[PDB]
Paper text:
In the barley β-d-glucan glucohydrolase, a glycoside hydrolase family 3 (GH3) enzyme, the Trp286/Trp434 clamp ensures β-d-glucosides binding, which is fundamental for substrate hydrolysis during plant growth and development. HvExoI folds into a two-domain structure consisting of an (α/β)8 barrel (domain 1) and an (α/β)6 sandwich (domain 2) with a 13 Å-deep active site pocket embracing the subsites −1 and +1, positioned at the interface between the two domains. HvExoI catalyses the hydrolytic removal of nonreducing glucose (Glc) moiety from a broad spectrum of poly- and oligomeric β-d-glucosides. The crucial role of substrate binding in HvExoI implies a pair of the aromatic Trp286 and Trp434 residues that form a clamp at the +1 subsite, which is positioned next to a pocket-shaped site at the −1 subsite, housing the Asp285 and Glu491 catalysts.
Numbering used by the authors: -3 to 602
The structure:
């Protein structure tokens, strides 16, 4: 269609499938393998990206251009990588991915939303959708076009260090929370064919249903381990939300490190190709986890050549290498030149990657929009996060005995009150893993409001607020307090670091609760990524609130504690009596919960 030098793949008015076929037909083998290669920004340089025809970059947890970097620093980093990719012969823009799993959580100043488990407590899919919307804007504020979210694992055992990333042990709740997808990506068209990728354009991002499949069903919740269960159980529990993701046009799927009945997911052709691609009709791209193909073997990386062959023949399209890109490209190249991996497999992988890039508009807007910088940490997104945090809270107890005055809601006006505990004034603890650092961190890591600051922000100006992290019972008994708010719980963790057979909160925790509650009527705010052993906290406490990992906006906690809103959350998981009951999920014959899934007390606004 006219102009000197016309190249159909560069024509924005053409259909995606023609632009894909047109571009695919021009590419060398090296250009093709390039597209299949995702590398860490930590190893990337303009020359590396140009010379290896690289298709994708990522930031892993904690991989930032620097500490405290502004939105525009992120945009400059991404645009600098992108300019190297656009200067290739074919000018194929790279796509940059990051774990924005509760907001754009690696970035200083980004709104941090509650983690998934707390979101499942809300039973509010429209809320999760609005969060996907906000998170897409804060990701695009940093120039990034691709979020590795949602995690739609169905965590069947909270001893797993990723239970907090699962909305529920019940797949129906997880299915309903796949509304994150159209939030991140935009709503699919009226027509839409299930399994096609969709992103609306430059204010949205490609999403990633992960980790396929059965990540939440491992033996003893051991991370990355073996999910021992029949096809019918896999399809009834772990698969269904992937079908909802197909219907919402999810752009990519990431494969799990985990195994199904002893078969590595990264080497499972029947599931990845037979099921995901040929039965669900997924037409987006399939991406490995981080060094996921290495972990196919034991030890990991001990036959990288087999890892490439296995993963690529299984049906994976893009490999999150992410460091050893030279080996990866050299080996896949040798497999193809040797006729061990057919060119049809390479072409299918590249078709899929290009299909997502054209569809999302990446060829038309390869570069960041500087005007989006101000979306980062935007007050309206914080207000949404605050609404979420509040809705995620589950009131487990409100009065020590059924005859006591309900402690909650607390009055805003009182002569003097006490805020206490390891988690009452620690932003990093309230956000948990995947915040600033991969494992999360302690202290004031970003912009946010702690529980202490929120209480000071909410109380009547005549109310005196005292903070004491770990006071003794005498300090409390002597202080003239009307009541105390005490926050304790788990420390931030992520992945295998959080696998935990005992599920008891660290000390001091319990002993601060007991010291405070023994001296004044107390409301205990428990911060955790999962149910933990809770009977001793309960026995000590007048009221107790499971606040999960509510994120950066601690005013969500106080909004409920002080009665601006009534408590509405309900447990999205079973609260066990003991870890030796585990696993124990709603619907088991088995079933003897301390609090059943769905449990939750309410209050009225004041
Ligand atoms: C499961 O965990 C044990 C270590 O606790 C390990 O020996 C085993 O290989 C793991 N299985 C898989 C499939 O990852
Ligand atoms: C909640 O609201 C209703 C009034 O509509 C009332 O009956 C109930 O006592 C209120 N208070 C509490 C603490 O439930
Ligand atoms: O899978 C392991 C890796 O994934 C994460 O995203 C991190 O950035 C890296 O530190 C960690 O080792
Ligand atoms: O950081 C990139 C990836 O690495 C991690 O190890 C996780 O398993 C995955 O969920 C994440 O998207």
């Amino acid at each position: 269609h006219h102009a000197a030098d016309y190249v159909l793949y560069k024509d924005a008015t053409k259909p995606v499938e023609d632009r894909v076929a047109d571009l695919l037909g021009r590419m060398t083998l090296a250009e093709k393998i390039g597209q299949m290669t995702q590398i860490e920004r930590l190893v990337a340089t303009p020359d590396v990206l140009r010379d290896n025809f690289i298709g994708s970059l990522l930031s892993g947890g904690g991989s930032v251009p620097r500490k405290g970097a502004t939105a525009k620093e992120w945009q400059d980093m991404v645009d600098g990588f992108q300019k190297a990719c656009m200067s290739t012969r074919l000018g194929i823009p790279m796509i940059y991915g990051i774990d924005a799993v509760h907001g754009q959580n690696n970035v200083y100043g980004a709104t941090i939303f509650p983690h998934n488990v707390g979101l499942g407590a809300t039973r509010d899919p429209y809320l999760v959708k609005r969060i996907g919307e906000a998170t897409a804007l804060e990701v695009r504020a940093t120039g990034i076009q691709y979020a590795f979210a949602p995690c739609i694992a169905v965590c069947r055992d909270p001893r797993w260090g990723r239970c907090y990333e699962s909305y529920s042990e019940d797949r129906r709740i997880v299915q309903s929370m796949t509304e994150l997808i159209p939030g991140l990506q935009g709503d699919v068209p009226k027509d839409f064919t299930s399994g096609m990728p969709f992103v609306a354009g430059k204010n949205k991002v490609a999403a990633c249903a992960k980790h396929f499949v059965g990540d939440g069903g491992t033996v003893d919740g051991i991370n990355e381990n073996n999910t021992i269960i029949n096809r019918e159980g896999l399809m009834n529990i772990h698969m269904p939300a992937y079908k909802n993701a197909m219907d919402k046009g999810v752009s990519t799927v990431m494969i799990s490190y985990s195994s199904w009945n002893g078969v590595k997911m990264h080497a499972n052709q029947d599931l990845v190709t037979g099921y995901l691609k040929d039965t669900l009709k997924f037409k987006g791209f399939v991406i490995s986890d981080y060094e996921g193909i290495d972990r196919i073997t034991t030890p990991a990386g001990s036959d990288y050549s087999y890892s490439v062959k296995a993963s690529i023949l299984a049906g994976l399209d893009m490999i999150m290498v992410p460091n050893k890109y030279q080996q990866f490209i050299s080996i896949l190249t040798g497999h193809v030149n040797g006729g061990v991996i057919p060119m049809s497999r390479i072409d299918d992988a590249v078709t899929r990657i290009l299909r997502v890039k054209f569809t999302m508009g990446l060829f038309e807007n390869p570069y960041a929009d500087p005007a989006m910088a101000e979306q980062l940490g935007k007050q309206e997104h914080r207000d949404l996060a605050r609404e979420a945090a509040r809705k995620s809270l589950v009131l487990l107890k409100n009065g020590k005995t059924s005859t006591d005055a309900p402690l909650l809601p607390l009055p805003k006006k009182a002569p003097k009150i006490l805020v206490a505990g390891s988690h009452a004034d620690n932003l990093g603890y309230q956000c948990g893993g995947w915040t600033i650092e991969w494992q999360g961190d302690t202290g004031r890591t970003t912009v946010g409001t702690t529980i202490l600051e929120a209480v000071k922000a909410a109380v009547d100006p005549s109310t005196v607020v005292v903070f004491a992290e770990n006071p003794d019972a005498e300090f409390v008994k002597s202080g003239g307090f009307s009541y105390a708010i005490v926050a304790v719980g788990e420390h931030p963790y992520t992945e295998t670091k959080g696998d935990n057979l005992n599920l008891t909160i660290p000390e001091p925790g319990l002993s601060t609760v007991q010291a405070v509650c023994g001296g004044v009527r107390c409301a205990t705010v428990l911060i955790s990524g999962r149910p933990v052993v809770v009977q001793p906290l309960l026995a000590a406490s007048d009221a107790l609130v499971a606040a999960w990992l509510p994120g950066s906006e601690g005013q969500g906690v106080t909004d409920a504690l002080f009665g601006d809103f009534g408590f509405t959350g309900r447990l999205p998981r079973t609260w066990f009596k003991s870890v030796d009951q585990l696993p124990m999920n709603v619907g088991d014959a088995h079933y003897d919960p301390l609090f059943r899934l769905g449990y939750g007390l309410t209050t009225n606004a004041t």
